[PDB]
Amino acid sequence: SFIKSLENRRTIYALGRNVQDEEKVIETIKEAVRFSPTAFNSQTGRLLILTGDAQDKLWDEIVAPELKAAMEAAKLDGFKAAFGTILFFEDQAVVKNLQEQFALYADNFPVWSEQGSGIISVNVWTALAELGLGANLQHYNPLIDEAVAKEWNLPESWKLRGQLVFGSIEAPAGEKTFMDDADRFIVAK
Amino acid sequence: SFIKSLENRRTIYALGRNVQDEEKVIETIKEAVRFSPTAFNSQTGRLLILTGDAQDKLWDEIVAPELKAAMEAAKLDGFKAAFGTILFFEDQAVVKNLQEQFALYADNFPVWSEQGSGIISVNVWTALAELGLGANLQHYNPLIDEAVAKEWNLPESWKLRGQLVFGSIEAPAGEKTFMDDADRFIVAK
Ligand SMILES: Cc1cc2nc3c(=O)[nH]c(=O)nc-3n(C[C@H](O)[C@H](O)[C@H](O)COP(=O)(O)O)c2cc1C
Ligand SMILES: Cc1cc2nc3c(=O)[nH]c(=O)nc-3n(C[C@H](O)[C@H](O)[C@H](O)COP(=O)(O)O)c2cc1C
């Protein structure tokens, strides 16, 4: 079922490169984003999908040095060891255009775009889990934004929101608790 | 498949009350939220699920008058005609607590909570579509926030984000276009 697909998506930190069909993975990522709703069908999400040498470069040559430099003012190997990283961005040029066209809702578009980023991130994450791949969601934005845009020649309007590290599952998800239903759901007739 | 479930979720404006098993609907809504990821497992989403008399009251006694009063400074019947409305909130008391506990990430929690709201909204929406029910997502916040909190005795900390109107499908979704893949996906190796 759909609910089963949701339940099967988990944060997996222990990731490897035992990925059988990279083309199918890419196809699935694209479909998960394609079929995600966005306010006014604005489709503000943008993805940079890195594998292979690009995956190694992101972690060794961008994240590690940017983090070290930022600290002066391990886990990184576990992220590198994964098959790839999907960097999720929101296109600010579209957001701004919508704000101008519908000034009535100018304040809403940034909010809906942020919601949109969450939406496409989890849809991709869950789609990957259905292929038997694990993933985890990181936030090294805004630290790495400039270096990523330069290395892969991204438009200035792409605002980095999240990095979904993915690969073969090499150890199970940890334990997870849930709130009491009574504290978050109220049903009235 | 999961991708098929995503594709099957659409905005349906023509909604009715031909709903066979309300208990199953409520169960599915809860599960879709339960199995949605949130930053640090913070589970900030809160739902008010209205059906029957409460559904009629929301639209006739709250949304319509608040909208009319706001205008002085149709579609509403189509929303009322639906089986119910799921009001999605984010708990600001939890957000604030997280900001205090992890001041390092204080700026991130509001963002992740907004993303969280998008995540649980679409997961619920898609779960409902799998039951054969349609839905559409409205934004009469912040106009109706006070009246809703008073009528259903909600905590002040619940910040309304969206209203998912749902019911039986009485007319098909409209047409929808998609961007060129080349404009939103970049793959690098
Ligand atoms: C908006 C959002 C932001 C998150 N931020 C991070 C992060 O920066 N680093 C990380 O390791 N996990 C992050 N998480 C993962 C959550 O902590 C995880 O989803 C949650 O604990 C539930 O566990 P599960 O993913 O195994 O279901 C994030 C999840 C979401 C939805
Ligand atoms: C964050 C978000 C906000 C939206 N806001 C509204 C809204 O206020 N009113 C409405 O009728 N539809 C709204 N939509 C619906 C979108 O316009 C719709 O999802 C999009 O056009 C794609 O069509 P689909 O839902 O049929 O796939 C919203 C969708 C999302 C994800």
TrEMBL record, chains A, B:
Q: Which organism is it from?
A: Lactococcus lactis subsp. lactis (strain IL1403) (Streptococcus lactis)
Major location, coarse class?
A: cytoplasm
Which residues take part in binding FMN?
A: R9, R10, T11, Y13, F40, Q138, H139, K176
Q: Which compartments does it reside in? A: Cytoplasm
Q: What CDD domains does the record tag this protein with?
A: Frm2-like (cd02140)
**Which protein are we looking at?**
Nitroreductase domain-containing protein
Entry keyword set:
Cytoplasm, Flavoprotein, FMN, Nucleotide-binding, Oxidoreductase
Please name the GO terms of the biological process aspect recorded for this protein, alphabetically.
cellular response to oxidative stress
Q: From which residue to which does any coiled coil extend?
A: none
Q: Cellular component per GO?
A: cytoplasm
Which PANTHER family does the record match to this protein?
A: FATTY ACID REPRESSION MUTANT PROTEIN 2-RELATED
* SUPFAM superfamilies, per database record: FMN-dependent nitroreductase-like (SSF55469)
Q: What gene makes this protein?
A: ytjD
Source superkingdom? Bacteria
Q: Where is the Nitroreductase domain?
A: 7-167
Which GO molecular-function terms appear in the entry?
A: nucleotide binding; oxidoreductase activity
Pfam families in the record, alphabetically? Nitroreductase
* Stored Gene3D superfamilies: NADH Oxidase (3.40.109.10)
